[PDB]
Write a protein that binds this ligand. Structure first.
Ligand SMILES: [Zn+2]
Ligand SMILES: [Zn+2]
Lengths: 132, 607, 153, 126, 182
DNA sequence: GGCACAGGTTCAGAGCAGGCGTTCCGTTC
DNA sequence: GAACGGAACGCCTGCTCTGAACCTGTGCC
């Protein structure tokens, strides 16, 4: 994953065919917590596009453990945006890592939900307002 | 060895010659049966081969000919053995009858590429003797429901009549069943909707008369709510509900009140209950037009059938209150407002030209048939209420003047186009029963009080030949298939009684009045009512000899052993053929003579 | 497995209730196979003899009979110079008569029965089956001398 | 629990027949107001013995092929249809007996054969 | 998965075919949800031509499918099979299938696949006849595979009317210097 | 002249029966 | 007596029988 994930995603014309196996990578029981954490150190170091998010939602879907060091960066990075993928990503973070949401990170999420392209905004802001 | 056995038999009956000479030597039919019998002393090496043989026979000579004598009869008689062999290994060997009934449904189910009516009638007599077996063999019955959307109507319709004795006792299997029928209702395959109806119509029929009654009267109203989806679903699947709900009513009386409202709602979607609106019914909402595919769905003539039958049933058997006294006035109003519906009401004859490619022609053609069959359901009703009241028989005349105008109109339309229009020869919905009682009233009533009302229908010669023709249509249905069209459909005894009543009048008019008295010309000589009486007579005696093999005695009792009765009846066709032939040579009635013969033939196979 | 469940009742049953003139214990040399002692049948030339037998239990026992030989030399019609036994319940059907309705004791009883009553119609030794029949005292002399050199102490 | 349980019979096939037959007659006379025992005693029209364990402490209710109870979960269930033998057996033991012999004759997934002890007809349904 | 399963109760009749296309869109787009899609398509109201198309669009990606789902897949193929689409799908089926490729859970579902194929071919002579007529038409190649053998043994084990025909075909095949040790 | 029954005809395909191949025995020089 | 030509039983195939459908002649309005 330290080798291959980057190039699959740092390739252009990465389609459904490519993503579905990095989907299966993250979703294997065998991909132990420790390794989902190491996946995180890697998924997070890449330029974020739609292809990074979809896989990352499914890694974060487990409740992969976070040092607040990385969670903040995930949230910082998350908070830098029009996308359906990203909508659901943010939503799923804020239900599982509600627990990890600071006042400052909830401001970042207030920033990140500013968009009106955001589908399911009612959901996202209801979840956000529910943290407040 | 076995088949030879049958070739030997058949041959030896046919001729007088061989019977004389040969002393009737043991047929391997009777020998093997005695083998099965004497495995009771429990030689259980034997039995595996007996099961093996009985099946092989049912395999090799199944009716695939039907999906003469020489290719049909000695190849009925191979499995009819097969059947008796396996029936007796099941009724004698208690250990086996698990693998026997396993292997029967093995063949009934996933097949239906080659037919299996013989297997179904084996299965039937297996389970009827001792259903108790079926409770060890539920495994197969659970995986039979699996494919109970890809099996066609008749496998499933019967397979389940057999099984259901299980589902009164077992319950986990019943929560497998309604589950399967429901998941079939929402199918692709058109058969699966109708599988759903049939399992549901039968769960509603024999799953209680009215476990606890309260967990059945609710469970019937549960599924019947899931059937108001099916009352919404496509034409055919609706049709099956109009027809099956009459038997649900007979076997489950107390759901009458609920089922009435289930229907009467579906009526009012097309009934406009205002006096002085001249088309009383909405015929154009029965018709779905999309992308020039113009389908009738919700057949109203067939809805009136179910209505009109549930009606007389409620008058007669449930009573010994407001919906039926309303429906009297509903039918009286549809009566009086339809009488005065002048083709102008339903855009026919002049505003439509029933042009059978066009959307408009397909719509108008669908509705003329709907009108015609509805006219028939109400001709029945006008006759039904009154004991020969001159007003309601004048009502009947005018309802028929409606029917006949639409009929001779589609005849003018089919007198131009090719005779692939078998849609006009789509069943007249009159119950065979009424036909009977009717024709008796028509041809066999001399009571002065009725006679003024009947002189209406009798001056009406077409109503006579109409009634008859329906007699012919019905009996034909019985010939083709093992049941009739209308009510009383699959209950042989009723059918038999009607046929007896039929015979009585067919002969009565055939005799009292000959063919030589006609005053009508060549077009009415090609369908003189005498001739049609004789032809009706024809199809009966034939069909009797297919099914009613035991009761042929009773058929004659209607009308001293089998031979004097048959002789006296033979004399009547015999004297008729003499009188037909001797009188004229000029232009002798070929067909009259022809079926006088086909008759004298049929009588002869008896003697 | 079944070997264990039979042998369990049998070892225990041959320590607690063995047949008369007979013992069988789990061998001290061989802690898998059984050692028997059948003491010379009364009013036979085997009188004053203690006859050691090894009983080999087969693996699919009790579906197969026990496998028994006379380890003490025995001068007998149905027993040869290597201790091989002419016995029906030492073979399976139809040649033999072993089945699970039997056990090691019932056969070791049938062995002391054959020591007392040699069968001359299943001869392994034709010289001894003939001598047994036609010069009984020469058989009984030789078998009693046999009992004094080999079955004595 | 008080409601009707699924119940069935092990033993000699001549003894099980009237019991099954009387259960089928009297299963509608089950009532969930009584106990399971107070319904079974009036359904099957019997009593139950109180621990024939202590009197029959060695009746040899062992396979009489392998001479063990508890071979791999299985119980001595298959018996003889005979008053004089009544000897129980196991599925595995009786099958490896009746398949091994000549005399034994199999219909489909059944073996008919002779009971080892008494040589009377005994049936095994796998 | 549940929405999918509930789509037949939800949708009205105008909007069946629509959903059809976009479900085939979802099919290529995600594998995991092959099963309920299929179940759905078969409990929709559609046009059979489209169903041929999607069935090929099963068949092309059938190497990509985890084994667990295959049985109900291949059950679907053999209820979508006509009398006329027999050898077509069967030759294609017979090719694309591997059963070398799959191999502790693998072996169990292979067995369960074979149970399901047994029940298919057990249960329509249509397949058995044509199946064979498709293995005899592979007497050409020395290279016909493990499946063809195991499958023959199977139709002889299950299907009875054919026993002579299997033996005939096997004898005319085996003499020919086809099936051998390897 | 146009359409539909009738019967001819044509083909799939199931099943039967006899002539051959390998081997023994009566007949004629 | 012995050499030649016919009798005997297991295998394969061509002939026959059938039945199902289509089509082309011809019968009537
Ligand atoms: Zn045992
Ligand atoms: Zn016994």
């Amino acid at each position: 994953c330290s080798a291959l994930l980057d190039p699959v995603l740092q390739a252009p014309g990465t389609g459904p065919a490519q993503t579905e196996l990095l989907c299966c990578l993250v979703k294997m029981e065998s991909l132990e917590p420790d390794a989902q954490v190491l996946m995180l150190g890697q998924i997070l170091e890449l330029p974020w596009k739609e292809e990074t998010f979809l896989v990352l939602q499914s890694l974060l879907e487990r409740q992969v453990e976070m040092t607040p060091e990385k969670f903040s960066v995930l949230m910082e990075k998350l908070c830098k945006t029009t996308s359906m993928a990203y909508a659901k990503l943010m939503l799923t973070v804020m239900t599982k890592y509600q627990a990890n949401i600071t006042e400052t990170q909830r401001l970042g999420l207030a920033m990140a939900l500013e968009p009106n392209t955001t589908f399911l905004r009612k959901s996202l802001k209801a979840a956000l307002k529910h943290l407040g | 060895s076995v088949v030879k056995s049958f070739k030997d038999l058949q041959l030896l009956q046919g001729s007088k010659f061989l019977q004389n000479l040969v002393p009737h030597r043991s047929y391997v039919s009777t020998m093997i049966l005695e083998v099965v019998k004497n495995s009771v002393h429990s030689w259980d090496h034997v039995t595996q081969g007996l099961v093996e043989l009985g099946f092989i026979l049912m395999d090799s000579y199944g009716p695939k000919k039907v999906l003469p004598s020489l290719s049909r009869m000695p190849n009925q008689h191979a499995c009819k053995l097969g059947a008796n062999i396996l029936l007796e290994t099941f009724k004698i060997h208690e250990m086996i009858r698990q693998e026997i009934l396993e292997q029967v449904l093995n063949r009934v189910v996933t097949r239906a590429s080659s037919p299996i009516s013989h297997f179904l009638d084996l299965l039937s007599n297996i389970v009827m003797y001792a259903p108790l077996v079926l409770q060890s063999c539920s495994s197969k019955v659970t995986e039979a429901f699996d494919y109970l959307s890809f099996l066609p109507l008749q496998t499933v319709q019967r397979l389940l009549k057999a099984v259901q004795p299980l589902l009164k006792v077992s319950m986990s299997m019943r929560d497998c069943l309604i589950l399967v029928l429901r998941k079939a209702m929402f199918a692709n395959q058109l058969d699966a909707r109708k599988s759903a109806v049939a399992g549901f119509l039968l769960l509603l029929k024999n799953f209680k008369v009215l476990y606890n009654s309260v967990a059945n009267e609710t469970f019937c109203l549960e599924i019947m709510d899931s059937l108001r989806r099916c009352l919404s679903q496509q034409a055919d699947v609706r049709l099956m509900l109009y027809e099956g709900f009459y038997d649900v009513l007979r076997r489950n009386s107390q759901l009458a009140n609920s089922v009435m409202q289930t229907l009467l709602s579906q009526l009012k979607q097309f009934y406009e209950p205002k006096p002085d609106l001249l088309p009383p019914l909405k015929l154009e909402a029965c018709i779905l037009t999309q992308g020039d595919k113009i389908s009738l769905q919700e057949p109203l003539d067939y809805l009136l059938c179910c209505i009109q039958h549930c009606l007389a049933w409620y008058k007669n058997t449930v009573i010994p209150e407001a919906f039926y006294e309303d429906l009297d006035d509903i039918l009286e109003s549809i009566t009086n407002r339809m009488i005065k519906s002048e083709l102008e009401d339903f855009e026919l004859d002049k505003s439509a030209d029933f042009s059978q490619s066009t959307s408009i022609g397909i719509k108008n053609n669908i509705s003329a048939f709907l009108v015609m069959g509805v006219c028939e359901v109400l001709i029945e009703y006008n006759f039904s209420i009154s004991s020969f009241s001159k007003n309601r028989f004048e009502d009947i005349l005018s309802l028929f003047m409606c029917y006949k105008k639409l009929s001779d109109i589609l005849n003018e339309k089919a007198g131009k186009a090719k005779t692939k229009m078998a849609n006009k020869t789509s069943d007249s919905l009159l119950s065979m029963k009424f036909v009977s009682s009717l024709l008796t009233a028509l041809f066999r009533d001399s009571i002065q009080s009725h006679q003024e009302s009947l002189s209406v229908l009798r001056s009406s010669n077409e109503f006579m030949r109409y009634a008859v023709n329906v007699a012919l249509q019905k009996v034909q249905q019985l010939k083709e298939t093992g049941h009739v069209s209308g009510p009383d459909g699959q209950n042989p005894e009723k059918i038999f009684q009607n046929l007896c009543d039929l015979t009585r009048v067919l002969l009565w008019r055939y005799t009292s009045i000959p063919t030589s008295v006609e005053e009508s010309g060549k077009k009415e000589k090609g369908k003189s009512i005498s001739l049609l009486c004789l032809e009706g007579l024809q199809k009966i005696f034939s069909a009797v000899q297919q099914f009613y093999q035991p009761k042929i005695q009773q058929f004659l009792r209607a009308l001293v052993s089998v031979t004097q009765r048959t002789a006296f009846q033979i004399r009547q066709f015999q004297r008729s053929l003499l009188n037909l032939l001797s009188s004229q040579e000029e232009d002798f009635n070929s067909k009259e003579a022809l079926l006088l013969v086909t008759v004298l033939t049929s009588l002869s196979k008896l003697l | 497995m079944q070997r264990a469940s039979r042998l369990k009742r049998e070892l225990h049953m041959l320590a607690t209730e063995p047949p008369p003139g007979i013992t069988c214990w789990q061998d001290k040399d061989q802690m898998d196979d059984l050692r028997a002692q059948i003491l010379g049948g009364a009013n036979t030339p085997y009188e004053k003899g203690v006859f050691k037998l090894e009983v080999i239990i087969p693996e699919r026992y009790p579906f197969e009979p026990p496998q028994i030989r006379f380890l003490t030399p025995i001068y007998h019609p149905n027993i040869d110079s290597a201790g091989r036994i002419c016995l029906d319940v030492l073979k399976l059907p139809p040649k033999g008569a072993w089945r699970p309705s039997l056990n090691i004791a019932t056969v070791l009883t049938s062995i002391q029965l054959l020591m007392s009553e040699p069968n001359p119609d299943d001869p392994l030794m034709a010289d001894i089956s003939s001598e047994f029949k036609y010069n009984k005292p020469a058989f009984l002399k030789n078998a009693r001398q046999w009992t004094e050199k080999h079955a004595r102490q | 629990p008080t409601m009707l349980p699924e119940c069935f019979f092990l033993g000699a096939d001549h003894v099980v027949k009237p019991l099954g037959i009387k259960l089928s007659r009297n299963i509608h006379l089950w009532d969930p107001e009584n106990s399971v025992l107070q319904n079974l005693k009036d359904v099957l029209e019997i009593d139950f013995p109180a621990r024939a364990i202590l009197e029959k402490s060695d009746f040899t209710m062992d396979c009489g092929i392998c001479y063990a109870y508890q071979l791999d979960g299985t119980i001595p269930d298959q018996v003889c249809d005979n008053s004089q033998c009544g000897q129980p057996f196991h599925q595995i033991c009786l099958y490896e007996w009746l398949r091994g012999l000549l005399t034994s004759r199999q219909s489909f997934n059944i073996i008919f054969g002779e009971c080892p002890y008494c040589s009377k007809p005994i049936t095994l349904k796998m | 998965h549940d929405i999918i399963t509930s789509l037949p109760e939800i949708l009205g009749d105008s909007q069946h075919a629509d959903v059809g296309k976009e479900l085939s869109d979802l099919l290529i787009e995600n594998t995991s949800l092959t099963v309920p899609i299929l179940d759905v398509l078969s409990s929709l109201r559609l046009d059979p031509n489209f169903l041929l198309k999607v069935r090929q669009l099963v068949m092309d990606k059938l190497s990509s499918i985890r084994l667990e789902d295959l049985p109900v897949i291949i059950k679907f193929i053999l209820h979508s099979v006509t009398a006329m689409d027999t050898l077509e799908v069967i030759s294609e089926l017979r090719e694309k299938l591997d059963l070398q490729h799959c191999v502790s859970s693998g072996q169990s579902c292979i067995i369960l696949l074979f149970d399901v194929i047994k029940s298919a071919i057990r249960y329509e002579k249509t397949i058995s006849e044509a199946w064979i007529k498709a293995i005899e038409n592979t007497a050409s190649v020395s290279e016909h595979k493990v499946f063809d053998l195991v499958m023959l043994f199977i139709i002889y084990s299950t299907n009875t009317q054919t026993k002579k025909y299997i033996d005939r075909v096997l004898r005319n095949k085996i003499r020919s210097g086809c099936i051998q040790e390897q």
